Amino acid sequence: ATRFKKNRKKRGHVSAGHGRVGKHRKHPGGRGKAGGLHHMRINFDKYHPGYFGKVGMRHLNLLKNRTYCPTINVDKLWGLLPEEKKKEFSENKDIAPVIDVTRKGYFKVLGNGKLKHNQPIVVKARYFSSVAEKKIKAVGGQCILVA
Amino acid sequence: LSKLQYHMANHPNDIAVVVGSITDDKRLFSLKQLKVCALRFTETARKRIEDAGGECLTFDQLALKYPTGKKCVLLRGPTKARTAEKHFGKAPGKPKSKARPYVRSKGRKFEKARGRRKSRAYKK
Amino acid sequence: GRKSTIKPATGIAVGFNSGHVVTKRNSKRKELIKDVVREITGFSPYEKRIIELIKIGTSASTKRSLKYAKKKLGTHKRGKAKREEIQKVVILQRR
Amino acid sequence: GAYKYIQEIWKKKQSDAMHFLLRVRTWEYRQLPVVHRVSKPSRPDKARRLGYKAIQGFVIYRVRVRRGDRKKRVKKGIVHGKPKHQGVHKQKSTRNLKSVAEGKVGKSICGNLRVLNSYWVGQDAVYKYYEVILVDPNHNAVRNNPKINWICNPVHKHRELRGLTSAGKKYRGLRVKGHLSAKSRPSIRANWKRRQLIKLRKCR
Amino acid sequence: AVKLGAGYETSAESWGTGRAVARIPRVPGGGTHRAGQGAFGNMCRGGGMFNPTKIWRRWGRKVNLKEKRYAVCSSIAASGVTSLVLARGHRISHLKEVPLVVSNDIESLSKTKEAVNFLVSLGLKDEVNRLVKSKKIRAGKGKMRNRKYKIRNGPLIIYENDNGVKKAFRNIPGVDLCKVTKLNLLKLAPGGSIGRLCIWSESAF
Amino acid sequence: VAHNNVLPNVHLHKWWQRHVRVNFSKNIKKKKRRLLREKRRKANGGTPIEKLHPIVHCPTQRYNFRTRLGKGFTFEELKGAGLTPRAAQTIGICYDKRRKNRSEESLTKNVERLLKYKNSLVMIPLKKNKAKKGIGGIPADADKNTIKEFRNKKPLLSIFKKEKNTKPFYETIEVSKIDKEFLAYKTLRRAKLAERRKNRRQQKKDIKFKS
RNA sequence: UCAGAACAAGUAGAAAACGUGAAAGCGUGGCCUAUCGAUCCUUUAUAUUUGCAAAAUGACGUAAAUUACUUACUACUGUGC
RNA sequence: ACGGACCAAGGAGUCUAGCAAAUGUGCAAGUGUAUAUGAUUCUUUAAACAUUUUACGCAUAAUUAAUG
RNA sequence: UUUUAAUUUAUUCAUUGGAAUUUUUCAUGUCGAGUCGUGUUCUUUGAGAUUGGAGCACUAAUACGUGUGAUACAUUUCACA
RNA sequence: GAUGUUAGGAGGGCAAAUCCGCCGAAUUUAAGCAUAUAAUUAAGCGGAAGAAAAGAAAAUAACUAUGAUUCCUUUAGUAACGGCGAGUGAACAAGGACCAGCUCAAACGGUUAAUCCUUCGUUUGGUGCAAACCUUUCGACGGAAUUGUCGUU
Ligand SMILES: [Mg+2]
Ligand SMILES: [Mg+2]
Ligand SMILES: [Mg+2]
Ligand SMILES: [Mg+2]
Ligand SMILES: [Mg+2]
Ligand SMILES: [Mg+2]
Ligand SMILES: [Mg+2]
Ligand SMILES: [Mg+2]
Ligand SMILES: [Mg+2]
Ligand SMILES: [Mg+2]
Ligand SMILES: [Mg+2]
Ligand SMILES: [Mg+2]
Ligand SMILES: [Mg+2]
Ligand SMILES: [Mg+2]
Ligand SMILES: [Mg+2]
Ligand SMILES: [Mg+2]
Ligand SMILES: [Mg+2]
Ligand SMILES: [Mg+2]
Ligand SMILES: [Mg+2]
Ligand SMILES: [Mg+2]
Ligand SMILES: [Mg+2]
Ligand SMILES: [Mg+2]
Ligand SMILES: [Mg+2]
């Protein structure tokens, strides 16, 4: 709200906070991104390193759909079950959960983190990372490709 | 919660106090019998604690119980793990800085050319 | 990218007929008219030229004809088609 | 069958017989006034394929249009602005010559009528000749007939002047559907406006 | 919002330097008093105001649903607590219980008079009197903009179903009515002050 | 530009003030719409404003799994139902000339839906009393009492909304039924590798077929 | 030099592979202090690295199999960009 | 050096967009109910309430010119 | 007052005409040309060996066709129109 | 083909916020400027309606696939364009509002144009105090039309 704007605090100070010698002029450094690469090079260098120049291949019609793959790490996979069910599973080493990871909105299973030892888990997903697959297997589980 | 558990690992039974919020961790499987004072428990975390047969103490309760903090443990969450903090320090541009530039987005088109690879003048 | 209509799709996201399980479910008058038109109109100058080229007989000549067709009609497909038609016409004439 | 035959004949165009006809016809047209009524379509089949019908209120007008680009209208050749905009002489119009043809008949000469469509007829190097099919929306023969009747509505005044005839549709780029034409559809201008639009939200 | 080109409808331009007059844009021409006058610019009579107000100012604010809910809950709690209610300004000294709950017979009251009587019986006679007193004509220019009277805010009757309450308490000054389902924080905490005096039906409760 | 901030990207170099629409009309507009729909409903005494739509699977690899209401039922599905397109249109059901069926299962589902709809619906006679059987698809016209009874009951709008997900995502499996030897990553990568050549052969196969 | 950015020019190394010397060593140009150049574009090198967006192009390659839309398995797969 | 004869009133860091930091607040591996719907919602009500008996954003993972 | 829902009563007799599905025969038809397209020019586009448009030159194919499948091309699939 | 003060009709001008066509700048930004930008904007010229335009796929996808247009939320400040500088910048999908499909041409019907219109009429009705309206089917006399009307899909 206007009442707690700085300008209201500078009300009777002559220069309105923008300094007496170096005035407040309109667009002194140029307009917008302006002299990046000339008089504002240094700022660009120090805060915006890779800004100028282009790189890599064009990709003329992207379609972000084609390439959509939300990921989850195996660590989080057991979290995807409710507490009580999880407890039950822990109790019965004799029976394992299948987890349709796609149903919960993730396509790739990546392999960050530990899985509970021995507790076997069946994972249904579209993509697995080598390591994630290895983790699952080591635990006595299966990775089942779905589509 | 996981972090709390880790911190409690060596000395059990004594009461972890945390001046902030404690969040739950889906990445934990098992929860030990924890006695924790905090400013806030996210609901799920609280529920988990309850299930563990633990105790969620507020600060007043803690004070009542342990006014000199006997058998307590102050803990902090990860402070400089904040995403804002990743833009601080030496500016990206200064060499050997691991500061994220403020950029619209990620992808080759955005801040990945001159001064980011030996091929386009220089690096960093 | 590619699939096959025979066989169900391998239950995989990527690769050949990758995808889900699901079981798949699948003149004379004109000729006469054309003839009439031919009788009426004959051919157009470019067509005539092409025919002549074809008659010349060799591979080089054929190539030349094709080139001409491309130049006139635009596009290699159309030109090819035209050439084929002309060849057919020539054959017919020869009979 | 007859109409099929004449379609096929007219496809040939550069073939001797057709060529001769075209030569005669264009010559004849060169002589007549720029826009003038004709009693019967010169290409009945083609007219039919568009909108033409032998109902009382339907009329054909033969119209001649100069070929070529239109010099950028400026006092003397000189243009006063930046070099990008400086050229005259290779300035091609957004409208088709067909559109122009229909425009000139529709507008001041036959303001009473409604332009339905137009077809090609002939050309020389100086002129292109079109026949434009028009209709009298007040003739009851047209008012009553439920197919066609539509043109009697007031929303169809001067279709030719709003680029709503086939030629108009062409140069607005509504003939091409798809990804090739995404940027023009409700109208190019309209689309542009939409894209510019800043929607705020009272709540925000 | 000010109309778009307010103060800028003129053709005015500045005469520039060599006339011994400030270089504010001037109205051109002659004959009028307006000729030669300072034209647009915040300083000038007939000028445009500075940053003219625009319809695209942010008028509303999104508030987090959860936050709103929390606020509502807190207001309810406040309404509960006697001291808070008292602070908020109500003459509640003669009411026994401040989570004040009343039988469903209230929801069927047909007549404002009856409602008033009921209120009096409850102990809110004083409150009612205060409400009656405190219709006064506003200070300032509100008077000119259909905000003529200023009225203090009385109890809030919360009801489960309208079989008469809406209509009967309508017309008692400062008395407001809300369905339990659709509680409005604007009514529960007028001027953002906690602890309005709420009268609940038992069903509502 | 100064200091360490995002490089500014504000597309306001055109006369943007000319086309700012502020939506002061939102809630009121919504209310108006609601009113209009109510009016429409009233006009169609008893009958539902809403039209039957088939459930369909969304395209593209990312919405693949989800299901939502398409426009219109496909000739084949109508046929299955035992229904003419025109007739269907006349009732509350949408028809889609351009939609096609690849999946038997999908087709079955939509015909099931159609059947359900048919079962649900009771037809008011065209000219009063005179109860006659329909045309092609449409059911028979019920008598008066039945109609009255139906009216007295609530008009169900459960069918016009899409069927929500079946759920699963957690399912028990016996440990002895797991196949511990099935390299899934290997399968993937191998498949990826082999794609081009399988493509090379499919084309050949196609060519062969074409003669 | 300095923002302790760049380029440039150096100093110190490491991994290769060599030269010289009997060797220890010395050699990443000139005994040392100058002799020089971003983005974009072009250009020609490099590569069991990729792409051209529904696919394919070395190659029906190698095995089987039967005439057919057959089943496996291959680091090497058109021009142009 | 310039401006100021006097007096009264008017008279100049504002508003939006998007980003950031700071701080408050909520909830927290989530968060924001976006359009839109619904209500026994209808002076105020253009707010408030509600969210159907896996929407999208940002975040939760990075990195590569790229197949990945 | 405006209209538009529900509710109330239709029942006899005439016959021209049409419609939908359903069998079973036979028909494999027709499907928009100075138009599409290519070249070239200018414009316009985010459209990139040209997105649309236009001028000019050249000027097609018949559904097994021709047009899209965002890199110019050829040889050919496939999908969609 | 001209010609008619022939009989009957139509257009013209005003108004414009939204709308549709053309036509078309420059200030401005780039700290200069020339391509770019401003902007397919302002002005100019023409044309409609209560909305206009668009619209029933020579569409998108590469899926388990969707299915006219429009609009909103988004995709996305993304793909892309650009003295690759300044800056510009969509589309598909997804979620909604709303949802409506169609008829010419061509094919077919010659044991017959079945069509269509002008003028003149004729006689049942309905509301109105009148004024007017509303419909009802029936012929004539004209023409139009085989260079193609109507039905069938
Ligand atoms: Mg000071
Ligand atoms: Mg000053
Ligand atoms: Mg100075
Ligand atoms: Mg121009
Ligand atoms: Mg004023
Ligand atoms: Mg005052
Ligand atoms: Mg002096
Ligand atoms: Mg001075
Ligand atoms: Mg003085
Ligand atoms: Mg003065
Ligand atoms: Mg903050
Ligand atoms: Mg066609
Ligand atoms: Mg441009
Ligand atoms: Mg595509
Ligand atoms: Mg006019
Ligand atoms: Mg400048
Ligand atoms: Mg300047
Ligand atoms: Mg200058
Ligand atoms: Mg204008
Ligand atoms: Mg329209
Ligand atoms: Mg949009
Ligand atoms: Mg984004
Ligand atoms: Mg632009």
Residue numbers in the entry:
A (entry chain O): 2 to 148
B (entry chain S): 64 to 187
C (entry chain b): 2 to 27, 38 to 106
D (entry chain P): 2 to 205
E (entry chain F): 53 to 257
F (entry chain L): 2 to 212
Task: Copy text from the publication.
Much of malaria pathology is the result of exponential growth of the parasite within erythrocytes, and given the critical role that protein synthesis plays in this, the translational machinery is an attractive drug target. However, because anti-malarial treatment at the blood-stage requires rapid intervention, we focused on the dominant, blood stage-specific cytoplasmic ribosome from the most virulent form of Plasmodium, P. falciparum (Pf80S), as inhibition of cytosolic translation would be expected to be direct and fast-acting. In this present study, we solved the structure of Pf80S–emetine complex at 3.2 Å resolution and built a fully-refined all-atom model. The ribosome model comprises the large (Pf60S) and small subunit (Pf40S) with a total of 74 proteins as well as the 5S, 5.8S, 18S, and 28S rRNAs and a tRNA bound at the E-site.
The structure of Pf60S superimposes with the yeast 60S with a RMSD of 1.6 Å2. Compared to human ribosomes, P. falciparum typically has shorter ESs, some of which are entirely absent in the large subunit (ES7D-HL, ES9AL, ES10L, ES20L, ES30L). Firstly, eL41, the smallest ribosomal protein, bridges the two subunits and has a 14-residue Pf-specific N-terminal extension that reaches into a pocket formed by 18S rRNA of the small subunit and tightly anchors the protein. Towards the back of the P-stalk, the C-terminal helix extension of eL14 caps the stem loop of ES7BL. On the opposite side of the ribosome, near the E-site tRNA, the Pf-specific stem loop ES34L is positioned directly above the L1 stalk. This ES appears to have caused a 60° rotation of the C-terminal helix of eL13 relative to its position in human ribosomes. The tip of the helix is displaced by ∼28 Å away from the L1 stalk and now stabilizes the interaction between ES34L and the loop of h22.
